[PDB]
Amino acid sequence: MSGAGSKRKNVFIEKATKLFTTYDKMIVAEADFVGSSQLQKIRKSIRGIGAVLMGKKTMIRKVIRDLADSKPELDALNTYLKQNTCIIFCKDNIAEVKRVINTQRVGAPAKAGVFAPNDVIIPAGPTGMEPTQTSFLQDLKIATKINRGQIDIVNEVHIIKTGQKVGASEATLLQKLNIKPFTYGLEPKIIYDAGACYSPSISEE
Amino acid sequence: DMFIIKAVLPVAESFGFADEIRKRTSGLASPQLVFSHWEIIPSDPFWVPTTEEEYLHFGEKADSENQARKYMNAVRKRKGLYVEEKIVEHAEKQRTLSKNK
Amino acid sequence: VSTAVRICDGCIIVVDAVEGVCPQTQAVLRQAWLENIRPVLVINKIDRLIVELKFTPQEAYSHLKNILEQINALTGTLFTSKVLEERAERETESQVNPNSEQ
Amino acid sequence: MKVINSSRKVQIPENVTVDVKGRSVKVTGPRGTLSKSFDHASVDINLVGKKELTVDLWFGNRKQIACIKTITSIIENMITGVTKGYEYKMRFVYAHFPINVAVTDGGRVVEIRNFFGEKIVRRIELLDGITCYRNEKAKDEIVLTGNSLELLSQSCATIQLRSAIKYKDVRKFLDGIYVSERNVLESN
Amino acid sequence: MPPKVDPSEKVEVFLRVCGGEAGAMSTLAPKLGPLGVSPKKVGDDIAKATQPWKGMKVSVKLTIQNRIAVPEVLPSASALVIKALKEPPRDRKKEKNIKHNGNIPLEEICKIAKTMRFKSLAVDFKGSVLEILGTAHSVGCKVNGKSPRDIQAGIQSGEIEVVEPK
Amino acid sequence: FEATPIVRVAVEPKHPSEMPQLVKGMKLLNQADPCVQILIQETGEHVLVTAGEVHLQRCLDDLKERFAKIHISVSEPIIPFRETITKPPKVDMVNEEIGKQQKVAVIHQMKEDQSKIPEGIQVDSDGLITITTPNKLATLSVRAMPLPEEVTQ
Amino acid sequence: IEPSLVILARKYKCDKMICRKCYARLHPRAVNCRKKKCGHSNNLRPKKKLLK
RNA sequence: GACGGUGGCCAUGGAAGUCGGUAUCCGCUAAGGAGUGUGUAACAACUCACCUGCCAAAUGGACUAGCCCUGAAAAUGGAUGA
């Protein structure tokens, strides 16, 4: 084929001329690796402050929308764009913009080849019984899955916790588990006012 | 322990149907045969398709050789009362009778 | 089958504990409730569940309940079905309290 | 009509000694050494220093160009393999009529015994240099390691070919020994 | 709607439509056979309760379990709320019959139900509902300015109001 | 006990000289396996009958073994169904009807379906329901309407 | 275990497509016979499973 | 990444994009057909259209027409004359 993704462009020309950069605060956010199903529910105060906007073909064309403002073109001698990264325009204060996305956040399920931190409890419900499942749970510390009047092969409380994070060893034991609600929020690429740039943050500073 | 469907099934199209599935799979297919009443379906079984011009206009095929005529093909003759049909009439000739009917 | 059932003065219900209650038997029996017979219940093929396929006797009990329920339904077509329920609720007439069985 | 062919360069890591006596390679690394023959198509093939071999030929056609690309690719694999040994794991599939797979460790010969009813002894001598070993993964799998990727793979294929049913349906049996984990290496 | 009583003794949520008043269907194991853990429906007339005058046909139901209890809950669906206001002839004896009939105003009743469908999409519950409902159905036109699943009306190509509440 | 649909089958002699044997055999069967129409006929010389569709087949096995050493050939163009008249015309003497000048059949028209077109579709193509036979010594009209299902039952 | 193996087997058995001329099996995403007897048909049908 | 309304209305009382009939809309987004198959009781799950991350300069296609190939099989041993 021959095009852009796999078809020629007629709406990505409009992403540069989508708005004027009237808003004084922007931030590069990594909300693409988290899924679109959960991404639309957390964003209610996230849109109305400037919205989640702009394409990633036009992220290089973004430079003509910084010359209008007092902002320099690059953020801190680098645009910081080597990832699925989108711009979120904000009207919230200099301290509030540091935690604008993390105020309402949620993660996606853990994939093959990565563990990810699991802070929230795992779901429950009737899923039969399996004796071979107990042999795989011997690697883990808790070897008990049947709880209460119901019967099932996974617990109602998270056994996978922070501290057990690794590259690729205990990640195979999560494929034995039948459900993956791995919460680690969303990820700031950088924080930025209108001239000065900062590192990713969760606090007011 | 059982799961139930109450699906209708014509009496003619089962001719050792319940016997096959029962033996093939006992327990996971136990058909209990229970009558109810005769369902009426939109189809008109009749001998010989008359005039194909009509058909060419097209609103299904009926009063002809059909899915419905499978049941009414040649069930008349179980040896039968006659070879096919023997009947005599005196309703013919409208002029001699002098009728408008 | 129907013809057979009304000739014979007695009866006996053979139902499977690994294949459920037989539908054929049920169908004919319902006609046979209009005739005077003495059908004794005997639940068969627990030899399949307990020994041959080899499942634990805890499961057997569980299985049996379903069978019993099925039988209750059968009973309830043209005969009464409340004594059975009562029995299920509390086994036999005497010994009403579990503490007293000690 | 007749077009010049670009050189295809390849970096060589410092683990190994690619020598090239008259357009014909030998690549000596940790796992041992692999030689190979080239100058099929009259190509030129040079060393710049000792971290860069480059193949080329400065006139020709699509046909020649393709060949150039091929040779380089082939050598890259060899380089990879003679430094880090290759692993082609073949898993076998039967437990209705159970399967008996055996391995002569000395001569490096797999011997497949009983599958699809057979009482025969099917012995397949592995190609030069490569080896095998029995591995307990899930009461399954023969792992075939070797440094010549071309040869090992070929051997595996041969085995696969030999462990199937040459008369009647190809799906009545899906059984036999087939490749499972391939393009696999090691550093342990 | 959210659940009326929260599932206790581990969470239990099951999904079969249970359409119409008639029938004694209940959801405990739609992906497996009949039994889940134990027999517990609860009640055969739950369908009726859920769908008295909301539909005889493709009527969705969020079945749940509170360890041997069901409090009757529906999703406030895009089909169920519009068909609630429709006349009893098209809500009764249409179980084995097609229905593509209903062009009356349903403007008021869907506004309150818009929060129950979704609670966070960054849109107006009385403004964006005139686009999302009304011009997305063949059994519900609302005002006759809109068009049933078309590109003639609902997106302001004939309408004048579209994001504003009517 | 006979069947509810009245399931029949064309029992025939394989050989012509074996006809008598066949005839005899049915009677014999009657005592052992209950109910066959060997005598007192609604359709044909003789037909085998049973309590159902599945049992019809079974009883034909029995009419080969034993008895008068009988052997049969069979002709089953499946089990017979029945018809219903839910639409008369508006032509000649019929008071209660649902005929018009566009709906001729229950679905579509008789013209669009095909066949059975003696007269036009604008007065229904189901007409000529009154007749005369012996020069007005036995004139009659007839009306076939749907009988209620409960009543039928 | 078994099912995974079965899939693998299929991949080296069923998946390959054939040419309506030889009936010779090329591979599961093919566009040609790549044989000179066919005449290089490029008119392939997939191989029919035990389901069909 | 491949969504919300949404399980679209129907058939169903299971068919929840995908046994299947007809309409085939709107939100929101970087993008996402009331859905391309695989799969499943139908779903779920997976993939496709659709988009984007990286790598980094060409890509895609429908045809025409030279030579070649396929089409292109037959009778002593054989013919660009060798």
UniProtKB/Swiss-Prot annotation, chain A:
User: What are the GO BP annotations of this UniProt entry?
Assistant: cytoplasmic translation; ribosome biogenesis
* Ribonucleoprotein in keyword set: yes
Instruction: Note whether tRNA-binding occurs among the keywords.
Output: no
- Drop me one GO molecular function for this one: structural constituent of ribosome
Q: How is it modified after translation?
A: Phosphorylated.
Subunit structure, interactors included: P0 forms a pentameric complex by interaction with dimers of P1 and P2.
Q: What is this protein called?
A: Large ribosomal subunit protein uL10
Taxon lineage: Eukaryota, Amoebozoa, Evosea, Eumycetozoa, Dictyostelia
Gene field: rplp0
From Swiss-Prot, chain B:
Q: How does it assemble?
A: Associates with the 60S ribosomal subunit. Found in a complex consisting of the 60S ribosomal subunit, SBDS and EFL1. Interacts with SBDS and binds to GTP and GDP; the interaction with SBDS decreases EFL1 affinity for GDP and facilitates GDP release.
What portion of the full-length protein is represented by this chain?
1020 to 1120 of 1120
Function noted in UniProt: GTPase involved in the biogenesis of the 60S ribosomal subunit and translational activation of ribosomes. Together with SBDS, triggers the GTP-dependent release of EIF6 from 60S pre-ribosomes in the cytoplasm, thereby activating ribosomes for translation competence by allowing 80S ribosome assembly and facilitating EIF6 recycling to the nucleus, where it is required for 60S rRNA processing and nuclear export.
The record names the disease as: Shwachman-Diamond syndrome 2: A form of Shwachman-Diamond syndrome, a disorder characterized by hematopoietic abnormalities, exocrine pancreatic dysfunction, and skeletal dysplasia. Intermittent or chronic neutropenia is the most common hematological manifestation, followed by anemia and thrombocytopenia. Some patients progress to bone marrow failure, myelodysplastic syndrome and malignant transformation, with acute myelogenous leukemia being the most common. Exocrine pancreatic dysfunction is generally the first presenting symptom in infancy.
Q: List the gene name.
A: EFL1
UniProtKB/Swiss-Prot annotation, chain E:
**SMART domains for the chain:** RL11 (SM00649)
For this UniProt record, the keywords arranged alphabetically read as follows: Ribonucleoprotein, Ribosomal protein
GO annotation terms (biological process): translation
Please list the GO terms describing molecular function.
large ribosomal subunit rRNA binding; structural constituent of ribosome
SUPFAM superfamilies linked to this entry: Ribosomal L11/L12e N-terminal domain, Ribosomal protein L11, C-terminal domain
Mind telling me which GO cellular component terms the entry cites?
cytosolic large ribosomal subunit
The record's family statement is: Belongs to the universal ribosomal protein uL11 family.
Family matches, as HAMAP family:
Ribosomal_uL11
Protein name from the UniProt record? Large ribosomal subunit protein uL11
Q: Which organism is it from?
A: Dictyostelium discoideum
Curated annotation (Swiss-Prot), chain G:
Localization in the cell: Cytoplasm
Q: Tell me the disulfide pairings in this chain.
A: none
Q: What does this protein do?
A: Component of the 60S subunit of the ribosome.
Q: How does it assemble?
A: Part of the 60S ribosomal subunit.
Protein name per Swiss-Prot or TrEMBL: Large ribosomal subunit protein eL40
Organism of origin is Dictyostelium discoideum
Which lineage do the record's taxonomy fields give for this organism? Eukaryota, Amoebozoa, Evosea, Eumycetozoa, Dictyostelia
Gene of origin?
ubqB
